[PDB]
Nucleic acid binder design. Structure first.
Ligand SMILES: [K+]
Ligand SMILES: [K+]
Ligand SMILES: [K+]
Ligand SMILES: [K+]
Ligand SMILES: [K+]
Ligand SMILES: [K+]
Ligand SMILES: [K+]
Ligand SMILES: [K+]
Ligand SMILES: [K+]
Ligand SMILES: [K+]
Ligand SMILES: [K+]
Ligand SMILES: [K+]
Ligand SMILES: [K+]
Ligand SMILES: [K+]
Ligand SMILES: [K+]
Ligand SMILES: [K+]
Ligand SMILES: [K+]
Ligand SMILES: [K+]
Ligand SMILES: [K+]
Ligand SMILES: [K+]
Ligand SMILES: [Mg+2]
Ligand SMILES: [Mg+2]
Ligand SMILES: [Mg+2]
Ligand SMILES: [Mg+2]
Ligand SMILES: [Mg+2]
Ligand SMILES: [Mg+2]
Ligand SMILES: [Mg+2]
Ligand SMILES: [Mg+2]
Ligand SMILES: [Mg+2]
Ligand SMILES: [Mg+2]
Ligand SMILES: [Mg+2]
Ligand SMILES: [Mg+2]
Ligand SMILES: [Mg+2]
Ligand SMILES: [Mg+2]
Ligand SMILES: [Mg+2]
Ligand SMILES: [Mg+2]
Ligand SMILES: [Mg+2]
Ligand SMILES: [Mg+2]
Ligand SMILES: [Mg+2]
Ligand SMILES: [Mg+2]
Ligand SMILES: [Mg+2]
Ligand SMILES: [Mg+2]
Ligand SMILES: [Mg+2]
Ligand SMILES: [Mg+2]
Ligand SMILES: [Mg+2]
Ligand SMILES: [Mg+2]
Ligand SMILES: [Mg+2]
Ligand SMILES: [Mg+2]
Ligand SMILES: [Mg+2]
Ligand SMILES: [Mg+2]
Ligand SMILES: [Mg+2]
Ligand SMILES: [Mg+2]
Ligand SMILES: [Mg+2]
Ligand SMILES: [Mg+2]
Ligand SMILES: [Zn+2]
Lengths: 98, 84, 129, 141, 149
RNA sequence: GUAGGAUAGUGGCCUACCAUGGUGGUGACGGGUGACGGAGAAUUAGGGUUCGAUUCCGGAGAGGGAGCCUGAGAAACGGCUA
RNA sequence: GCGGUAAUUCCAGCUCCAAUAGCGUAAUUUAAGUUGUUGCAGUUAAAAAGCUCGUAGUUGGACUUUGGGAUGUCCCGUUACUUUGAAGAAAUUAGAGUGCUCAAAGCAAGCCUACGCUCUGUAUACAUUAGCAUGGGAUAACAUUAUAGGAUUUCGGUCCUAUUUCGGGAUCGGAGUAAUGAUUAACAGGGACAGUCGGGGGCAUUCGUAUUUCAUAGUCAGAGGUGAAAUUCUUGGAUUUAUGAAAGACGAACAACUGCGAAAGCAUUUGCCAAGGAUGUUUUCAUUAAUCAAGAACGAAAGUUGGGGGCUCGAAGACGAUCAGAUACCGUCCUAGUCUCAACCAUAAACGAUGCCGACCAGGGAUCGGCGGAUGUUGCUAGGACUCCGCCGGCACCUUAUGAGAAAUCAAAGUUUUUGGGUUCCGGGGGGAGUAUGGUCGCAAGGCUGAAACUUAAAGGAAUUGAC
RNA sequence: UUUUUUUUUUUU
């Protein structure tokens, strides 16, 4: 039985899509199928922000940010709980969680 | 428009104009011929609205229109009148 | 490609009648199509139809009464003798009380009852009821 | 889709002719292999009893089905034939003359008996049915 | 659809219902034939002649004023080309593709396109042989195709 | 194809000479058939499927080939010759 | 399916049931719409060739004389097909008549007893295809059309023949007559043209960090890796830090329910070379078309032969772990390979598990390319960017059933027992088996084509409940 | 993300 209309990927009007390597296990996975997340977080964790600011060597300074694009295979994405198994009706929802 | 709300033999002119030229009840082109005059020369030349060639006035040897993807673009100086 | 203009016309009328449309469009036109429509109109299965001239094959707009259950083409156009009409009607028509098979005989395009009356055979064009 | 041309009768006939071979019943009766089988297209065949054999019944049943190894006289082929009815194997002896019939499923095994397609009808010219009901007696010689 | 692709475009000309010349047009049929013959002598194909007439001389359709097609007029004056224009252009395209392939052996796409173009050439040439627009001995050969043009 | 021979007679049926022809995916040629063909038989919505050694019609054979006399008629076998 | 110590199923008794002078058992028809022309299937049940071209075959748009007056009748090249007729052994089949006692049958027979009669009867129908003759001229197929060498009247020159100057020919010219002779241009197709568009193809040519190695310099005890370790590298300085060089791969982020390509596939710049769809077109040709045995072009990855390269990763192999074992999963080092050229190979869950062409068929919002119209801005140079309304073409998506379906689902998997638009391929319960054999291609690996004996009651699809 | 192998035949 077929469970997804898109077959678990995002390929339309296309023959082949080159793969990426899973950021967790290194497994090959088509890019249109890999679960991709973009993480933008402060280099200094919120706990240490005050201590680092108190030790600033300049009158003013804005702490940088860390940018990471994570590309997971299906297995790692499920195991890491990046995505979860949804009900038959709920897995047709494509909007990101609020 | 709902099918029973319109007459296939007497469509409103707006709908016929909006339709594709080949999909109208009777095929009719959207092109036309125009009388183009240069800015300075009294000579008057007929030009196709969708000319594929650079029409040049014989007297002053000036380009009247430039071919494009669709309708030809006239030179800024020249003006045209719909001929038909 | 377009192989049977009559098939396209009849299929358009059938689909429009099923949908409930009061009018349908037939393109291209043909004299076989016109004869079929005249046979249908003779028996009250369609209203007035109008031929539109476009310096090409033409177009027809047909009024639909709502009495047409199904009109269809038969392909290939099999040879039908005067003795095979009974079998063809049994195969194609819902009942012996109503329904018509359109044939093309050397005497012209006509329904099967008229063909029986004139004792003329030909080739089967289609059916309607 | 199907071909429908009025001049396409040859193609339809040829396609049906080619596709008939996919039918197992048609192929069985048109390949000419019935003549290489033990009966060679006959309802019955006579043979000589070589040995009595017991065949275990198939799951979920448990029994010893009594059968005889018979060599057909007309071609020398060896087959296994079931001996029906209670204690009817006692009417069979080695080197006896037996008439063999099909098991009813046209060359296929029947019931819980594996790989047996034949049964014994007569022994020494006397039907097994008569022997079972004591209507007749097996000839002494 | 397209013969040698999956394109389904419907872009085409829409001839007007009116078959008569416009009132503002004043040129005469013999004059139009004279210009057509002059253009053909200058080395213009019927398509080019029609395009030039429409774009410059205000002649939307030559048949409207002359009553006949451009190629018919050219033939009546002994000016029609030995081989038809469309077949000529197809052969020109084939020659160009073969010339390109002579220096690009790894260009397999060009080989595919050459196969398609030569299939088109052969089908069109067969049609023209059926209608006696080419001599029965005519045959397209890749080796000496460049000579034909 | 020409001219002959032979035949009850046409015909490469055979001979001499001449020409290169003839058939074929619209399946030639080759192979299988537990294949004599038909009138017919079984079953029957219609279309079809299967069978047809056997008393009527036509053909062929007389253990296998071949040759032949007699005769209007046979390449006969309840005729002959090898 | 019965039988394992309470057997409606075996062996028996009784009783009962079906047919009945018949009944049981062991090739072929029906049922089988499970061979499907009528009339089946091919997304997941068995199934559409990886993709395109293409000859045979099949199929192929529209257009040429209608009407009234009247009354079957008057006025303005070759075939298919259909109607009718002849002819077409009997027996058999259907069928008329007839009390062999009935019947299967047979072709008999009936009145009355007349030295007889019913001329007693012994009908009639059916009969594929092919052939013969006849009426029709719708639908179809083949052939033809315009370099007039055309049709027709008359007349001048040339060449031959017959019945009693003449008739019949066979050619060469002058003149005349005429409405003088060419359907349209398919929301068919090809071709030309214009501005475009694209990660389509080939060749050449810039760039990028990273990896490994090396060179220089600095510091000193660990570094690496794991669930935890060890193999391993390390005071001959590992790892780490800065600069630089070389080599070979790889082209991140941008990058998408986006694009191009027949498919496979295709993502750094710039140039060159041919190619292409869509759009626009009052340009051209005029049926040139659709789909396709045979036969061809291309065809991921792996693999093969020989060069060049050989950074990384890494089949095989070797070690270290884990384990009862561990020929593995985990770690460490590595050959072939991974890259490129020349030549092969031709297979993939080569997938949309869904042939191509054509028509119709609900709604909606997005998006890519082209085009038309309107409108207001831009730190810009009429244009470009954005906004709005439309047309064509494309990749898709959402809702819905009046549709289909075994459902899952599908806006095509719809317009199908109310069954027929054209055309190619291809399946017929499960195994044996994609095996044997033969052929053919390949260096090889193997590819293509492709059985049978025998075995078996299920295998299998979708969905429901429970259990896990 | 250490490690976790197995449960005679028929029938209920
Ligand atoms: K799928
Ligand atoms: K995904
Ligand atoms: K058992
Ligand atoms: K049992
Ligand atoms: K195509
Ligand atoms: K176009
Ligand atoms: K003779
Ligand atoms: K001869
Ligand atoms: K015979
Ligand atoms: K005699
Ligand atoms: K007991
Ligand atoms: K008991
Ligand atoms: K029972
Ligand atoms: K290497
Ligand atoms: K290795
Ligand atoms: K263990
Ligand atoms: K290979
Ligand atoms: K797939
Ligand atoms: K769109
Ligand atoms: K048991
Ligand atoms: Mg599942
Ligand atoms: Mg792929
Ligand atoms: Mg095609
Ligand atoms: Mg189209
Ligand atoms: Mg002779
Ligand atoms: Mg017989
Ligand atoms: Mg026999
Ligand atoms: Mg006998
Ligand atoms: Mg006989
Ligand atoms: Mg004889
Ligand atoms: Mg004998
Ligand atoms: Mg003898
Ligand atoms: Mg003899
Ligand atoms: Mg005898
Ligand atoms: Mg005799
Ligand atoms: Mg008991
Ligand atoms: Mg009992
Ligand atoms: Mg089936
Ligand atoms: Mg499966
Ligand atoms: Mg399947
Ligand atoms: Mg497949
Ligand atoms: Mg092929
Ligand atoms: Mg037609
Ligand atoms: Mg057109
Ligand atoms: Mg460095
Ligand atoms: Mg892009
Ligand atoms: Mg980049
Ligand atoms: Mg090498
Ligand atoms: Mg390594
Ligand atoms: Mg390789
Ligand atoms: Mg395959
Ligand atoms: Mg746009
Ligand atoms: Mg099977
Ligand atoms: Mg164990
Ligand atoms: Zn992973």
């Amino acid at each position: 039985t077929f469970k997804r209309r898109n077959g678990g990927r995002n390929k339309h009007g296309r023959g082949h899509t080159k793969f990426i390597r899973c950021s967790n296990c290194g497994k090959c996975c088509p890019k249109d199928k890999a679960i991709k997340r973009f993480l933008v977080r402060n280099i200094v964790e919120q706990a240490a922000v005050r201590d680092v600011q108190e030790a600033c060597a300049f009158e003013t300074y804005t702490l940088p940010k860390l940018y990471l694009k994570m590309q997971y295979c299906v297995s790692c994405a499920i195991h890491s709980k990046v995505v979860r198994v949804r009900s038959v009706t709920d897995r047709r929802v494509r909007e990101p969680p609020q | 428009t709902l099918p029973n709300d319109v007459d296939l033999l007497n469509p409103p002119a707006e709908l016929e104009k909006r339709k594709h030229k080949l999909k109208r009840l009777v095929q009719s082109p959207n092109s036309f011929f125009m009388d183009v005059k240069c800015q300075g020369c009294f000579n008057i030349t007929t030009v196709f609205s969708h000319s594929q060639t650079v029409v040049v006035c014989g007297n002053c040897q000036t380009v009247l229109c430039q071919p494009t993807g669709g309708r030809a673009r006239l030179t800024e100086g020249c003006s045209f009148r719909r001929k038909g | 490609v377009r192989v049977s203009v009559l098939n396209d016309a009849l299929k358009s009328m059938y689909n429009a009648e099923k949908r409930g449309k009061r009018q349908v469009m037939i393109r291209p036109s043909s004299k076989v199509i016109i004869k079929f429509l005249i046979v249908m109109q003779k028996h009250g299965y369609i209203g007035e139809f109008e031929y539109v001239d476009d310096h090409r094959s033409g177009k027809i707009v047909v009024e639909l009464n709502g009495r047409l259950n199904k009109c269809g083409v038969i392909s290939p156009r099999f040879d039908v003798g005067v003795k095979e009409i009974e079998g063809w009607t049994a195969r194609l028509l819902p009942s012996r009380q109503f329904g018509y098979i359109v044939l093309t005989t050397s005497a012209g395009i006509m329904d099967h009852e008229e063909a029986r009356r004139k004792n003329v055979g030909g080739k089967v064009l289609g059916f309607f009821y | 889709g199907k071909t429908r041309g009025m001049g396409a009768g040859r193609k339809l006939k040829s396609h049906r002719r080619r596709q008939r071979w996919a039918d197992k019943s048609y192929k069985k009766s048109h390949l000419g292999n019935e003549w290489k089988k033990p009966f060679a297209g006959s309802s019955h065949a006579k043979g000589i009893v070589l040995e009595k054999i017991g065949i275990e019944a198939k799951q979920p049943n448990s029994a010893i089905r009594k059968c005889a190894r018979v060599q057909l006289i007309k071609n020398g082929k060896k087959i296994a034939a079931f001996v029906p009815n209670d204690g009817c194997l006692n009417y069979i002896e080695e080197n006896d003359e037996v008439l063999i019939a099909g098991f009813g499923r046209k060359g296929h095994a029947v019931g819980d008996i594996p790989g047996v397609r034949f049964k014994v009808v007569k022994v020494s010219g006397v039907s097994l049915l008569a022997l079972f009901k004591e209507k007749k007696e097996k000839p002494r010689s | 659809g397209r013969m040698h692709s999956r394109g389904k475009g419907i872009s085409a000309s829409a001839l007007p219902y009116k078959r008569t010349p416009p009132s503002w047009l004043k040129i005469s049929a013999p004059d139009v034939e004279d210009n057509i013959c002059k253009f053909a002598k200058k080395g213009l194909t019927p398509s080019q002649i029609g395009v030039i007439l429409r774009d410059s001389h205000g002649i939307a359709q030559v048949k409207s004023v002359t009553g006949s097609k451009i190629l018919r007029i050219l033939k009546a004056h002994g000016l029609a080309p030995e081989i038809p224009e469309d077949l000529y252009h197809l052969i020109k395209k084939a020659v160009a593709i073969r010339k390109h392939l002579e220096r690009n052996r790894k260009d397999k796409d060009s080989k595919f396109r050459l196969i398609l173009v030569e299939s088109r050439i052969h089908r069109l040439a067969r049609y023209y042989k059926k209608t006696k627009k080419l001599p029965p001995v005519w045959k397209y050969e890749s080796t000496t195709a460049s000579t034909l043009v």
